[PDB]
Assembly symmetry: C5
Homo-oligomer: 333 residues x 5
């Protein structure tokens, strides 16, 4: 045996009973798997690396070069106890064997690597949906050892994070990867040090335009064609107005199926409900025209063209909706 494993008790950390042992971390992100709006979490796959020194693993050599071991020797030596804070579920790949790397230098320096998949929560805001921008983070912390026994820091500062060029999401644009560090306090155990990985996401608006914004606009313009039809065709204009109202209600209902039950109004809800009001006022407009015409006929009868409401509605209704779009798209850009 090259290493004298059997001659030491590895239940105690290096420098037991003394100062803390420094540990460095490197991370390479492989891919982001999925994002859920209803559950408000994301899935990430990454490579995690650790650096430390242990004099008990020293062996004699003349080349002074790192040597690689099969990786099942890990379960017999001391290893850090990092865990992902605020995670929902995670696992380590084990095909065809445990994805574990162990390299030991002659002086005792140790390199340890893993391949894990982690699901973590992210508090998203949907006030500006679907034109919103979201920021999420991943947290790494040691579970058992406090800052007085283990010091956790990035190995090379800002250069310790790498990303694969194949990272891509169909619905989101990924940007601004950076790392930060902060302390954490638990009231009954002590102080701990945390590491952060931050990134930003931006949606794509093309799908929502074709699916929601364009059908809504067309249904509104369908109601405007009733102002150019003769008012004597009562069974022709009434069904046109009513059916557009019901179809607009169907479009409104279908949008909410894919989103969580938030307690505030979203940007898309404003567009849909104002459009519903425009179609609803179209139905009331003809009822006023029909009622006034009948009253006039009876008044003229008791003595023994285009109605002004229709003439003005052809101009006011298109003008108001255009003004609404100008204001709406100026606020949400």
């Amino acid at each position: 045996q090259l290493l004298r494993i059997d001659d030491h008790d590895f239940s105690m950390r290096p420098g037991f009973g003394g100062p803390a042992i420094p540990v460095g971390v490197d991370v390479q992100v492989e891919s982001l798997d999925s994002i859920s709006e209803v559950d408000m979490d994301f899935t990430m796959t990454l490579y995690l690396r650790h650096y430390w020194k242990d004099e008990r693993l020293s062996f004699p050599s003349t080349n002074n070069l790192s040597m690689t071991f099969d990786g099942r020797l890990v379960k017999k030596i001391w290893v850090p106890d990092m865990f992902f804070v605020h995670s929902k579920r995670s696992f380590i790949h084990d095909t065809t064997t445990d994805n574990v790397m162990l390299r030991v230098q002659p002086d005792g320096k140790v390199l340890y690597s893993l391949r894990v998949t982690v699901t973590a929560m992210c508090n998203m805001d949907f006030s500006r949906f679907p034109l919103d921008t979201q920021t999420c983070s991943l947290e790494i912390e040691s579970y058992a050892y406090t800052e007085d026994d283990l010091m956790l820091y990035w190995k090379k500062g800002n250069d310790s994070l790498k990303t694969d060029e194949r990272i891509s999401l169909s619905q989101f644009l990924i940007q601004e990867f950076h790392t930060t560090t902060k302390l954490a306090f638990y009231s009954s155990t002590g102080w701990y040090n945390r590491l952060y990985i931050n990134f930003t996401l931006r949606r794509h608006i093309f799908f929502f335009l074709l699916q929601t914004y364009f059908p809504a606009t067309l249904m509104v313009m369908l109601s405007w064609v009733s102002f150019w039809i003769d008012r004597r065709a009562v069974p022709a204009r009434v069904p046109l107005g009513i059916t557009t109202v019901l179809t607009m209600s169907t479009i409104i209902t279908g949008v909410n199926a894919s989103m969580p039950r938030v307690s505030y109004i979203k940007a898309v809800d404003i567009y849909l409900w104002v459009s519903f009001v425009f179609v609803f006022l179209s139905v009331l407009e003809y009822a006023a025209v029909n009622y006034l015409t009948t009253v006039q006929e009876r008044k003229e009868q008791k003595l023994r063209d285009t109605h002004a409401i229709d003439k003005y509605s052809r101009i006011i209704f298109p003008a108001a909706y255009i003004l609404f779009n100008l204001i709406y798209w100026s606020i949400f850009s």
Copy 2:
């Protein structure tokens, strides 16, 4: 080896054959994950801590300070056997290692911690849905040892429960965290002691207003516009009344898709079905008007304006529906 583990048989609890061993518990809640109405359960993630004393783990030292071990020594010493009563499923996180903490003082005091996710059942009541308030609880009990062998109590009374400030639910408001204690009896094993964690939830009404209450009101008001149309347009008023009835039926059906098949009427069902009656009576109203007009024409013919029903319906129908809303919102607030 610092601890004389091999010199003792840890298959027997401390004080075996004598009085009970006291055990203290501390809990910190991390987050609540999800709530299911159809399955009537909730998911919680928390940190669980235990306190006890064991003289067999004593070691000599001069500093009199707690020492931390890697946590894989737990499987070789005596550990309590707590379990969650009335739980459906649960697990312990194990990445990158088992989330276990073990700290032993020189005199033998032991601190043990875990990170678990538990799903537990809750009997909810939906009589006042969606304006309901629900209360749920989590129960902790020892499986194997009765009160004559193990005493279970909160470590610091009311101060033993802590909550993270990031706990949030999109649909519910969380309040009133407190802890209680009660005994339990099993007819064939004996008496046990239980610990409780209680909290309260309140829904948000904004989503249900826009989705159910507002579309229902608009469809009712669509039926009222038929009272202002000339009664000679038979193919104009009949389709208007019929189509609103069918659309109201569609709205009623869609609501029940998201709820369990309870055997009592809910608050939302009352609003929807009374609205359906209002629209249904609108269809019968014109049929009476049409029939009476035809009878009058034949009666006048055999001898060789606005009908009174329409005139009164314009006032009675809006007044009745307003009175219903006043009573309905006064009862359910």
Copy 3:
């Protein structure tokens, strides 16, 4: 060590090579989780207890009282091999440790307990759905040992089964818990003894009334209003009849989504399809009225009020449907 475990080979049952060893069973039901109509199975959580005697586990004492062990000693002694027959999936809870209890008396009597969740199949009949009553059972049997080596019986007869007062199902009513016993034969291994747990379930009819029976009745009564409208309004009565037919077809389709593809007619199908016939005959009725009127006009023209069909339909159609309901609800109660 209190027990002389190392001095015996526990690969052989007590009384090896001789008469059978009696084993007693006690069960306490905790809850029933879910019932699936499409898969025809149910989920149950329960506590399972075993009783037997083994002289190899005797230890000296003066108090003659049961002693409790941590439960990880189970994997080193002989334990019965019970399994659930006709089960689909099952598991044993293991948080924070294996839910196992082991108690040994000085003379060698052993008490063993477990907490398990079991899914088992049940052959349900839906001929009278949704007014049906279903009976299901759970079976317990030893896998390896026949009746010549192990005798299985209830510990206290009818008193061996206990149920939690919190057992409840939202859609079903649970009643009539009792236990029975019967032998089983396998053609290639021998005879075995089985234990049974039986219970009965009854549905709640409130949900199905509001969801299926009430909308169906209202759509039929909508078709009857066409008999009171003037027959000269052809474009008014034709759409009314046609649209009710299509809506009734939609209601029929939606019911079958939640049920398995059985090969026999159910009680709810009878109500829906007879209702469809009533609406369908309404459409044919006006076509006969319209055709006869046109023929009469041409006959009178070639020589140079209310039609009798409408008058009789106002009485016959409501009377027939009322008679159908009287017969239908008298058979299915």
Copy 4:
């Protein structure tokens, strides 16, 4: 210890370095769980038994009778290495212990049994859906040992397969269980012997008749009522024809939701699409009638009853559809 396990190295099969060792197999089927059309696989639960001889397990006795061991001794002796070919997933039940039986005779004969659940693929054909008949099979083969080291055969020929009388499927009829045997060749490892279990399935047509065939026929007959209505009611006959076309399209769409995206036409698709053509031609028929009537009026006007198309359509349309059904049901029976 009755068996001299420690005196032998069980890493080598019996008769190592010599002729092959015969192994017999018996199977008893317990139930079939589910069948998936989209994934094209089935789930089966069964008992698997093995027979062989090993002189290293002999023990002295005077009774010459089989003795049963607890089953955890299996992990210390040589056991065959059978696996299920073309399986997707499978597992062995382990509650409350591993479902393993081990019986050894004095001369060394060994009986070994297991309880497993296996999911296996089946290539189904849907050309005659839903009147199709499917055949599937389950394959058993040894993984490591070729025919020169292990011979695999059925223990008792045709009598080696047994089935439980409780096997039942709600949608399928199960028949014709039988077993066969065939050799298999792998280009880089050698020859192997396989065992087969075959069965046949037949669907139930009742559900599809009520759900698809009956609604389709009724919608076609609804279009025929327009031939008996006066041709002067243009706004009465046009909506009747159009609405039946759209409803027929809805019925066609709903059927394909439950089936995989095959690349050939099915039997049910033929019925639905021919029915759509019949309804579509009804709409074109009235357009021809309306156009010819207007032309005739203008021709007669410029000089200063029932149309023949309607008269013939009342006979030709019902006759053609009846002939189609006679041919359709004669081919597919």
Copy 5:
């Protein structure tokens, strides 16, 4: 024991501290399970084989033939550490035992085999959907050892890949299986060698023709029948045009339910939206005809047949749509 396993430490690879050890790979594909457009991944089942030499496993013999071991000896010897890059999830079958083969020759040559199921991501493009062609690949790489310690290559070059003749997909056509090799670099660990398996997929167009292209064409031709109806029937032509617009909108909405929310327009979207424009212009066409007729009547009145727009529309509208189809199918073939 035939092998001297206990006399060596298998935590170090063969040739430790020296040149790299060559490893050969063979693959046989069994089946492809499923393809997901929303998640952009595929599932594959395959057999993986490894070849290497280890002098520590040599044993004496006179026949010079491969010997097969039960496969549980794998966990005690050195085995490569291959893993699938860019995979989402995977597992190894373990019924009725681990699907592992181990064969060792007298000189130390080792053959190792596995049966695994792997899910891997594939970046698909839907610009030409549903007439698109997709290419995907599977990557194999060693996790722990770099090119200086382990050399990875195909055992027999182009002949190392085999496929089962039963591989089939209902919606796709599989072709062009081939293998390639390329190096990979990680910035913090070194150089690695990768192996690739490539294949191509082509969709079947039959389903999409009947489901989307044919219903869209028929609805357009329904709007053309309004040009042959007398223009004095205002309540007859207006509902015909309006209802076809709404039905076309429904067809457009239903298509997008099964596809991911991409940010570019697809081939099917072009056909659907141009068809919607054709139906929309039909509604505006009659409004122009109706308005001009009313103006002409008033102009002639104030002084005290077929309109030209309808005559030309009968020719221009069919001609334009035919030209569009010729261009559309010439580009996308």
